[PDB]
Amino acid sequence: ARYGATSTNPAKSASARGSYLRVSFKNTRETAQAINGWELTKAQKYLEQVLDHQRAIPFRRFNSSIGRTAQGKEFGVTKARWPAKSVKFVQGLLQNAAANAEAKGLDATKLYVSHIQVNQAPKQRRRTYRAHGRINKYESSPSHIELVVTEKEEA
Amino acid sequence: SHRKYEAPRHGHLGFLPRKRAASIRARVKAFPKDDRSKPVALTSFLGYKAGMTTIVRDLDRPGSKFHKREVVEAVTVVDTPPVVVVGVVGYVETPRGLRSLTTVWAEHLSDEVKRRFYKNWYKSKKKAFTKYSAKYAQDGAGIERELARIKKYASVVRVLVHTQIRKTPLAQKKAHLAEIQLNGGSISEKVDWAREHFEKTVAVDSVFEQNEMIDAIAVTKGHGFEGVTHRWGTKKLPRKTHRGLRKVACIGAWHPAHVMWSVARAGQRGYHSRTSINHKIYRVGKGDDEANGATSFDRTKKTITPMGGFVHYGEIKNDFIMVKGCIPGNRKRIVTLRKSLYTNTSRKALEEVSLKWIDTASKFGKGRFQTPAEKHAFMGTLKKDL
RNA sequence: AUAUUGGCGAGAGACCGAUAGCGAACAAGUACAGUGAUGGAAAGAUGAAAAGAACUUUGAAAAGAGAGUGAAAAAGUACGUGAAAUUGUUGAAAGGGAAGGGCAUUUGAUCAGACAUGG
RNA sequence: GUCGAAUUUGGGUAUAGGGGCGAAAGACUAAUCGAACCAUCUAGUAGCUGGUUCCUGCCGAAGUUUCCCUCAGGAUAGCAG
RNA sequence: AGAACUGGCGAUGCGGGAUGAACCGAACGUAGAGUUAAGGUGCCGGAAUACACGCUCAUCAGACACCACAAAAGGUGUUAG
RNA sequence: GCCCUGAAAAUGGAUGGCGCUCAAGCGUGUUACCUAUACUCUACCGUCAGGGUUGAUAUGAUGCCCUGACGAGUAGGCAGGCGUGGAGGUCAGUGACGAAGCCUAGACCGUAAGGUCGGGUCGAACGGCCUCUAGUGCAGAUCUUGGUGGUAGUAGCAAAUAUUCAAAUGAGAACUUUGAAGACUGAAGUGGGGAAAGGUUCCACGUCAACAGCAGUUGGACGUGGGUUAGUCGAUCCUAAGA
RNA sequence: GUGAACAGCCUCUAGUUGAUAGAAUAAUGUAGAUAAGGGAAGUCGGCAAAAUAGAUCCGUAACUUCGGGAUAAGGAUUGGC
RNA sequence: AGAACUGGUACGGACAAGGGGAAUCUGACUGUCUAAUUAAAACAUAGCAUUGCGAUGGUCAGAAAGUGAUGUUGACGCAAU
RNA sequence: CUAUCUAGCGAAACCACAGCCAAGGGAACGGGCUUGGCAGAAUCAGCGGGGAAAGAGACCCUGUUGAGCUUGACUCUAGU
RNA sequence: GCGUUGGAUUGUUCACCCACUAAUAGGGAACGUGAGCUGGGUUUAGACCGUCGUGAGACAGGUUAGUUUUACCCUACUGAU
RNA sequence: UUGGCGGAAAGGCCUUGGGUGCUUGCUGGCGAAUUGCAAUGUCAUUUUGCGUGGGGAUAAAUCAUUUGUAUACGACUUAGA
Ligand SMILES: [Mg+2]
């Protein structure tokens, strides 16, 4: 409970979290925005093709030195990637959402991802051994993910 | 403080930027001066380079040690099947340069050309020039008006022609289309000659002839991202150089505190547009002809195609231009063959040539025979056959 | 009668308030390091009370969504309050080789002081 | 390089800091050697380098004199409050 | 590099000299209105492409104190004597 | 006199720039005009000086009031104030009907240090005035401790010849187990044992949260148990340099 | 097994097949190779690299402490049956 | 050891495996050292020479001693260069 | 074999603020100032011109600061 | 506008001689150019001399051996979207 | 609406014929206030969405796959109903 800013009808909306998740915060971030606002099924069908290297995830912020792909053209972009570990987690949360939305008798076909935000969990710390007797950190940058799916308005 | 010894810089600063050409069909940036006192004819030709071979001929160069002597020369054979007119374009002189005023196309546009306007031809409805063809229905008017527009204004007239690439070994179906300046008399005669050729055909023998010096415009064979050594002919560093020696040592003095536009750097080699001039024509072959590669000296029925086919290209079933020496571009690549911007009254340029022999052994190895006949006559009979 | 930063038993302070006060308010001369002599940390706070979340449901599980407990979960054994750096999301805005500042006003947003005169 | 000897090596044993050990390099003496390591005297002294934490109001300088093992410093007189 | 008297800069913003510790003008509470300084008034740029008499043509003109240099020596260029 | 020659330097460039030729250049003269924190008049802040006034005469005598002049400032001196922990005194001060704290391009007061209020959050204490007191105010010290960034999903994860097919198990298999194939160490071994050293790492079963810089169902990991049998192997006895 | 051989190379018993992985094959690298003609002209300097190399038989200079120098140098031979 | 025959004249066919020569400076030689920038021509050495000492002694040790090294020794020795 | 592009994994150096030039003056070699040239999102592989790039001057001098060493320097001492 | 060289000796800059040549001009760019090389000389510590000094040691005097680190950032430049 | 003319960016210009509104060329009949003595009183044309009614037309590009005239990655050149 207590998500980030949400400007949605809570009764047309079901939601899902995922905390202390060991995925790249940067990478997860990039894929979460990649579906931010999609119709749930479009989202699910696209995140599947990303696992297929059939489509891709546009890298927009955390993205320098990343290679370029023809698959970015779709989104008017040039650097993009196929971050499996993140697609996968984002799917598990997408699937949990759809689940809870069903137990709410929310119509499957009106559902779109109205909110989705990922930010940083506490660092998990490991050592690396550097030349000349030295030691440096070798850290995980884990993730918190939280999305909401919502029933689209009819006019 | 002043370089210790003097040497000339590596490379030509006139040929920058060493980037990859904007297109694979190299632009023609000048045509010959129009003499409006002589018949209308094309000023350049399209064509596909096929390969090279060797010639033997007597030299006609009085005062040379090889005057009245045999010489062997390399030649390249560019495959030039007749082109087809499908449009004219009129240009008007403005104080901002030549401007295309209008363009009129032919009633009927072939599939080869039509394809040039499509990326995905196969899965398209091929609606290319469908509505434009309807302009011909109103007995004249639409088309006629614009022809008249060109006659009235328009300081120079160009024709749109395109290659019949199907008459050519190439896998590519899509045809190459280009503008060509009409250099025969009168702006009016030009557009009329143009109209009287719509959908029809022009061939090289109406453009070029024996011993004619022609220039060659083509994009240069690609080589990808080159180091500084081969890209610029830079001296190699000594074997003891830490972290590499195919570099240049001093990319610059301390001041200007900037690497300068003029020092040698690694990057693209090849795929550069090049207008190479002054290649004398040694043969204007006919396609129907079965003695392409024959001579009034060597009188056997053989086609210009060597035994085994032109390597990485195939056979020469059409007319061809045979030019002395070599030429920008690799095999299969589209080449514009432009005639000269000046009247070279040289001596080299004036020499009329007669070939004595044309090579036709396999270029796919150390070819030992000219014809299937000759190979059989020499080898006798084999375990296979008869 | 005099001395007493040790020992035992006590009574106090215009002392410090968890980076302070003894090194240690905690299984601290501990964990750890060093052949050794020696060196030597960090670390306190759910709630009045575990009432520490039955049960349902999605998941391989961890958990999540409901439900439930409680004065409050905007207290869930990561637990009082929960600042800043830095971060995600939402919303407004600006951006031809930095950004930020000063005087002035346009536009936009926001906020005001008014109070009492016959029906 | 040398490779059957002034050979290489295990364990044991001896030598300990102005001391050891050195086929001699100021070498080696536990990643420490032209004097090891540990704790104490010790918050060693520094005319030298660096920092020195709120606002407003008033007045407002000196790099000159004399003496100094004095010359990157003091005392003295001046300027200042 | 070192003295003399004074004025400055240092410790000081402001107007001018494009720029700039030191030059010129002028020293400073918060403001309004007027007038000026030194310096400017084709356009950048507030302010006469103002008035007046001459001089100057440079295939290396010239254009403002401190100040961002120029000489011995020459010209049948042109002006006045 | 002006003009010309004498007059040669290194990135591309400087009457400040454009550009200017009866000048927008050089010499001289005459008007007009632009503009400083300076000058003139005026309001207000403050500082200094001079003066009036508690005669009964409500709330400031260190007060009210009148008049004139003045205002640069480092190092530095003095003054008047702002804020903090704790102390005596007093408002019979605020407070679970919400203290302190925190957040807030909301509001008001002060030239300022600062003060006051609203809203949100919060949950047990705390403040004004007169005095007392000091371990009393930070941007700097390659300051101390802790926490966090850009760098950056980047450097990189390339020595030691080399892996492949299938099946089983499993939520999940490039990495586990069995099967097959291809190869390696090639007895100076990647084989079989020991000595210093370690101390349970051995074996079984279960098991993957952390750890094995990919992964994991695997492990020298985690959890639970099990295991080391002597008259003859050693120590033990002896003497060695030495102690 | 080859061979002088506990060398190198291949094998048997035994033990491994473990050192992130996939797709490409730009530059520049690190490591391994080769180059027509010339032959140290490169460079402080033949640094690096290249040439020689086992064995049998032949042959072998100055100098010398008579021991050496010396595999001096220089030659020919080498499979299989 | 010899001979005959045979092959794209090849045969230590992989593997394994010295380049040689003429000199100058210098150290005799094998040996040694600056662990982690100097392996040398530096240190050592055999060889040569010099010095001290017959024990109530030479050289050295210790705060002192009924203390100790050489010394289980004696000039063909111990000590010092 | 790398570099490269992908999945997983994931550091460090350094950081006043930053990052286009020419000339000027200027602490006499500016990314910032003045006057000009100019100047268009977001980026990939390379590169060694510049950032007087990065990591309490050992040279030199000054200090009434040392230490290792030498000696008919000053003042001493075990020993003899 | 365009060229301005190949070599013997030296770390050399400079110099000198051979040789070719149209010509073998002179300078700048942090005495251009070391995260570009190289490391021959100067410029630590090893060592050999000569001169000097009683000695420790000293001598732009000779001699020999002596570790050349980082770019993945910004900009510039090369190329690429 | 009849004829022409204009390509430098013609995108406008001349011309024929009538139709229709006005006509201040001239002569009449009405209206205007109280918007209170100025403040606020002509609406210009850009874009973009929607609302109607008429005319009109009925595609490609990209990912994926493929070629190798191309290529570090994007990109480039091919081919696929
Ligand atoms: Mg010296």
UniProtKB/Swiss-Prot annotation, chain A:
Keyword annotations from UniProtKB, A to Z: Cytoplasm, Isopeptide bond, Phosphoprotein, Ribonucleoprotein, Ribosomal protein, Ubl conjugation
Broad class of where this protein is predominantly found: cytoplasm
Molecular function GO labels: structural constituent of ribosome
Cross-link Glycyl lysine isopeptide (Lys-Gly) (interchain with G-Cter in ubiquitin): where in chain: K45
Gene Ontology biological process terms in this record: cleavage in ITS2 between 5.8S rRNA and LSU-rRNA of tricistronic rRNA transcript (SSU-rRNA, 5.8S rRNA, LSU-rRNA); cytoplasmic translation
Modified residues (Phosphothreonine): T69
Location relative to the cell: Cytoplasm
Entry annotated with the keyword Transferase: no
Disulfide pairings: none
Keyword Nucleus attributed: no
Any one Gene Ontology cellular component term annotated for this protein: cytosolic large ribosomal subunit
Domain of life per record: Eukaryota
Residue stretches in coiled coil: none
Oligomeric form and interacting partners: Component of the large ribosomal subunit (LSU). Mature yeast ribosomes consist of a small (40S) and a large (60S) subunit. The 40S small subunit contains 1 molecule of ribosomal RNA (18S rRNA) and 33 different proteins (encoded by 57 genes). The large 60S subunit contains 3 rRNA molecules (25S, 5.8S and 5S rRNA) and 46 different proteins (encoded by 81 genes). uL22 is associated with the polypeptide exit tunnel.
Protein task: Component of the ribosome, a large ribonucleoprotein complex responsible for the synthesis of proteins in the cell. The small ribosomal subunit (SSU) binds messenger RNAs (mRNAs) and translates the encoded message by selecting cognate aminoacyl-transfer RNA (tRNA) molecules. The large subunit (LSU) contains the ribosomal catalytic site termed the peptidyl transferase center (PTC), which catalyzes the formation of peptide bonds, thereby polymerizing the amino acids delivered by tRNAs into a polypeptide chain.
Leftover remarks: There are 2 genes for uL22 in yeast.
Family of this protein: Belongs to the universal ribosomal protein uL22 family.
Protein name from the UniProt record: Large ribosomal subunit protein uL22A
Source organism per UniProt: Saccharomyces cerevisiae (strain ATCC 204508 / S288c)
Residues shown, of full length: 2 to 156 of 184
UniProtKB/Swiss-Prot annotation, chain B:
Pfam families membership: Ribosomal_L3
Modification Pros-methylhistidine occurs at: H242
Domain of life of the organism encoding this protein: Eukaryota
GO CC annotation: cytoplasm; cytosol; cytosolic large ribosomal subunit
Cell location: Cytoplasm
MF annotations from Gene Ontology: RNA binding; structural constituent of ribosome
Keyword field contains Repeat: no
Modified how: Methylation at His-242 by HPM1 is required for proper 60S subunit assembly and promotes translational elongation fidelity.
Phosphothreonine found at: T102
Purpose of the protein: Component of the ribosome, a large ribonucleoprotein complex responsible for the synthesis of proteins in the cell. The small ribosomal subunit (SSU) binds messenger RNAs (mRNAs) and translates the encoded message by selecting cognate aminoacyl-transfer RNA (tRNA) molecules. The large subunit (LSU) contains the ribosomal catalytic site termed the peptidyl transferase center (PTC), which catalyzes the formation of peptide bonds, thereby polymerizing the amino acids delivered by tRNAs into a polypeptide chain.
Note: Present with 450 molecules/cell in log phase SD medium.
Protein name: Large ribosomal subunit protein uL3
